[PDB]
């Protein structure tokens, strides 16, 4: 019977820390404080709210993992997500998922090289945020 | 679906499927939202043939 409503960052961070560490907020106070300090001064005006870049990055990663079929499945999932109007900040969700993604090959147990390319994305900084 | 099951259960006097000369016949003025009249008619004709046999 919960209706989506904007809850303070503290509540979300507390719940997140509890579930990640699997301990009470009292047992993660130091980590909570460190995370709070880092997070509390971080606004992303430089992130380009463009799902296409994230999707392309995901496809390239899957290809690197020899998972072209998984890339197609991911594309279909992204299409379905676009069909649904539940999420508003899809670029943010995709960026978060990709950043928190862990390569099953890193299938295998490691990944061949990390020659990060200049490809990357946009800086959006050009706008007067 | 329910009327089809009742026909296949051997129920007589269905509203859509009328039994004429021992032949189950579909009422002509029946339409379903998801089927064409001709397609529905063909499927119901196969079902009606089996119902007439029963």
């Amino acid at each position: 019977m919960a209706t989506p409503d904007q809850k303070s960052p503290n509540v979300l961070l507390q719940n997140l820390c509890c579930r990640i560490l699997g301990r009470s907020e009292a047992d993660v106070a130091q980590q909570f404080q460190y995370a709070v300090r880092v997070i509390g001064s971080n606004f992303a005006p430089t992130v380009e709210r463009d799902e296409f870049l994230v999707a392309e990055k995901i496809k390239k990663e899957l290809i690197r993992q020899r998972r072209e079929a998984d890339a197609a499945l991911f594309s279909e999932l992204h299409r379905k997500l676009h069909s649904q109007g539940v999420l508003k900040n899809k670029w943010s969700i995709l960026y978060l998922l990709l950043s928190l993604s862990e390569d099953p090959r890193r299938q295998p147990s490691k990944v061949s090289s990390y020659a990060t390319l200049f490809a990357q994305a946009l800086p959006r900084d050009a706008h007067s945020t | 679906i329910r009327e089809t099951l009742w026909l296949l259960s051997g129920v007589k006097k269905l509203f859509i499927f009328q039994l004429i000369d021992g032949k189950v016949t579909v009422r002509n003025n029946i339409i379903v939202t998801h089927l064409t009249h001709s397609c529905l008619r063909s499927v119901l004709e196969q079902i009606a043939a089996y119902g007439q046999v029963v």
């Binding site: 019977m1 919960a2 209706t3 989506p4 409503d5 809850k7 | 379903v32 939202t33 998801h34």
Partner: protein, 43 residues
Amino acid sequence: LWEAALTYEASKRRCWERVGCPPGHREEPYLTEAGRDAFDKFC
């Protein structure tokens, strides 16, 4: 709150007469079959 609401299950019943919300709408049987209270109402 969105995540507590996420844990809600919904009916798998779909129909090809409905496309905008195919979450089911409970055909609700009728001819006897709606149970004792409906039979009492019918009586």
